């Protein structure tokens, strides 16, 4: 019709959404958990320091076994580590050094890497030739791969510098669904545990919840003042944390459609680089541009602890599926394991 | 204690370590460079000229005088560079191409902003990102011959009133363009290096070699406590 119609209906619907949210704001999380006993100090020690990356570690992913993790560095290697034994299981020479994302398939059979090359490189770990080789070069994006995450051995969700996400069929090497609706450079993915949903943060400071199967953006979360560098689902799939360059995390609930809590402190001017939840959801661990990770009580927003063993920007932070340990990777090339 | 299999795993780990160290040696003996430029700055013809002069992201390996140069053209990234330009925090230089013909061109596609003022805005933003405090900037002012044409047809005073020099002279105009770019650096310890080149000129790879040599001399001055 005309912008004097459609772009005013958009405003009316945005106002109706905000009104519906504020009607849903029965009581903030901080009021309901005011009676919850705090978690105290979560003191944690560096149990492992995985040394052998030579450039900035950019991304990591725990395997489902909660023991192996891949990690990507701009030396052009993926390293798979036995975190129990400090052993390097594989080091993969990558065609493009400019890695920025890393995924482990939940079976362990594959790893993915992506970068300024607009490819998510699916590497097969279990060949009979006993070398890792590139099984697929998923080459249909047109801006850098910011995040790749496997749904299954045949399916990976991907996030790019081009504002789109794409679901891929690895077998046929092609997009099965493209998720169009962010306006900013989209930065991080997390699949929900049921794998039926995922949530994505972009430089437009919005988070969008996508149906993998339908393709629809069910909901859009907007409370951040700047880019969502980092995103993670709360382990029930009903909430997710969003870390931003505004030096805040925010907890969004998928069914409140609303910001539940903000994790902020005046001393914290540095942006959040990674977020992950402890298995019970009770701790939210945030990496920073400051050379630290802060452990937040996700229910009460008290800083239960700080992981301070790094001498450069923490780039990635994953908690094992079993909750047993926190890995922290940083621009000092060291991947420190904590519990 | 470790079993026979855990020992052979450790041995694989240590063989991977020695491969990682040998690729560290290789990746450190190569000077990375980041080639940037505006649209129609001539990245293709410029690289092709280095390629004939030599004996979504394209790494061009060059190997000069036993030193290897990894000239990173980041290509057509449809992406917000603030989110990935820190990948190049470690590069020894930004190579910035500006075409000296761009002063007469206004952005025909969008508005009428000078093609040189967009190049100025990109130069300012790159030179002011905190990642590039240790990198120098190498500024190739390409297509001087097209400026040597345009000056006969489109006077530079009409597009930049700050030009005090003569309207006849190519030298005074390209000196003015270099001044108008060098003025943009607030980090006056950061040496901008600049060359005037043409697609005819094979010397550009020697200029790159020697500008990167000077950057490494400056860094070795800082690293070795020589002020």
């Amino acid at each position, epitope marked *: 019709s005309e912008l004097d119609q459609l772009r005013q209906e958009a405003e009316q619907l945005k106002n109706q959404i905000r009104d519906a949210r504020k009607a849903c704001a029965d009581a903030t999380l901080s009021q309901i958990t005011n009676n919850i006993d705090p978690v105290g100090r979560i003191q944690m020690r560096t149990r492992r320091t995985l040394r052998g990356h030579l450039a900035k570690i950019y991304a990591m992913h725990w395997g489902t076994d909660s023991r192996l993790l891949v990690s990507a560095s701009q030396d052009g290697k993926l390293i798979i580590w036995d975190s129990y034994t400090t052993n390097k*299981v594989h080091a993969i020479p990558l065609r493009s050094s400019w890695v920025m994302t890393c995924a482990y398939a939940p079976s362990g059979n594959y790893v993915a890497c992506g970068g300024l090359d607009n490819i998510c490189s699916i590497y097969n770990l279990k060949t*009979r030739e*006993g070398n890792v080789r590139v099984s697929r070069e998923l080459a249909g994006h047109t801006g850098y791969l910011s995040c790749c995450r496997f749904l299954d051995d045949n399916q990976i969700v991907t996030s790019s510098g081009d504002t789109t996400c794409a679901l891929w069929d690895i077998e046929t090497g092609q997009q099965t669904t493209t998720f169009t609706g962010h306006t900013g450079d989209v930065m991080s993915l997390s699949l929900a545990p049921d794998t039926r949903l995922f949530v994505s943060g972009a430089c437009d400071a919005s988070a969008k919840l996508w149906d993998v199967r339908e393709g629809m953006c069910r909901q859009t979360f907007t409370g951040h003042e700047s880019d969502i560098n980092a995103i993670c689902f709360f382990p029930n799939g009903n909430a997710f944390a969003t870390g931003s360059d505004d030096a805040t995390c925010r907890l969004f609930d998928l069914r409140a459609d609303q910001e539940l809590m903000t994790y902020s402190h005046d001393n914290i001017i540095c942006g959040i680089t990674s977020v992950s939840f402890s298995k019970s959801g009770r701790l939210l661990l945030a990496g920073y541009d400051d050379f630290n990770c802060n452990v937040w009580d996700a229910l009460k927003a008290d800083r239960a602890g700080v992981l301070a063993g790094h001498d450069n920007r923490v780039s990635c932070l994953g908690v094992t599926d079993d909750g047993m340990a926190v890995a922290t990777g940083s621009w000092d090339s060291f991947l420190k394991i904590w519990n | 204690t470790l*079993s*026979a*299999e855990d020992k*052979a795993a450790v041995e694989r780990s240590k063989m991977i370590d020695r491969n990682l160290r040998e690729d560290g040696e290789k990746a450190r003996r190569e000077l990375k460079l980041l080639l940037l430029g505006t649209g129609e700055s001539g990245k293709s013809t410029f690289i092709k000229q280095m390629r004939i002069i030599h004996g979504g992201i394209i790494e061009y390996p060059f190997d000069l005088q036993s030193v290897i140069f990894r000239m990173v053209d980041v290509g057509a990234q449809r992406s917000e560079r603030r989110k990935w330009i820190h990948c190049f925090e470690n590069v020894t230089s930004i190579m910035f191409l500006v075409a000296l013909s761009e002063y007469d061109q206004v952005l025909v596609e969008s508005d009428n902003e000078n093609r040189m003022e967009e190049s100025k805005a990109l130069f300012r933003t790159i030179i002011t990102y905190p990642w590039f405090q240790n990198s120098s900037v190498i500024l190739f002012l390409n297509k001087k011959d097209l400026l040597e044409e345009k000056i006969m047809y489109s006077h530079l005073v009409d597009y930049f009133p700050e030009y005090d020099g003569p309207q006849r002279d190519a030298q005074a105009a390209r000196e003015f363009i270099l001044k108008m770019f060098v003025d943009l650096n607030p980090d006056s310890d950061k040496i901008i290096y600049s060359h005037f080149t043409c697609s005819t000129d094979t010397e550009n790879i020697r200029f790159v070699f020697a500008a990167v040599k000077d950057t490494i001399l400056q860094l070795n001055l800082k690293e070795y406590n020589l002020v």
Partner: single-chain antibody
Amino acid sequence: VQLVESGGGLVQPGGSRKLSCSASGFAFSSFGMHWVRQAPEKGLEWVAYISSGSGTIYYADTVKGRFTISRDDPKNTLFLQMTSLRSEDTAMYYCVRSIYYYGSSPFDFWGQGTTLTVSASADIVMTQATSSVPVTPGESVSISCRSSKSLLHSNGNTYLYWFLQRPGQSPQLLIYRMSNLASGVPDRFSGSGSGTAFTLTISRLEAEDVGVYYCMQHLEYPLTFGAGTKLEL
């Protein structure tokens, strides 16, 4: 993936011969290599191991010093230079590849073997007290193995392996670390054990399952095999 062993045949005792095998279709330098031998009517015996990069070479006491194991990784070829050959060295010799990382399957591929004819101890003892089982297709049969030491290492891995030598071909890995089926093994195989007693349960047996079944330990060198239970159709 191929291993082709060659340079067997007949030698006079006290002689010397270099039998060899060449690898194709895999990153041989990544793999560690074992030699396993089989006397003309006897069980498997581990001869030697050479790891990736020619480190941590090991031999059996029956071949230590007298045999030397080497690899030409650029040529992807393995050589066993035998010397002081003896009547007890008459065997089929197998190249066996091996790879060692969390969750790997070592001993997965075995070359076709090479015959050597000669004209004529805290080593873990492995017992397969049942040397034969009469089997009928569709039956369930539960091969059992015992070791003179518990294979449950303190890291929780039971370093036990099962091999099937289908009659007239090289052994094939069925199970690694007591309870993982190898690539391509039918899911009808299953492994179980207490760490010192073990049982292989071939459910829904097939005529492809008859042959000789070896249990092996990978806790300590020398690597040791049971005598092998033969399944007879």
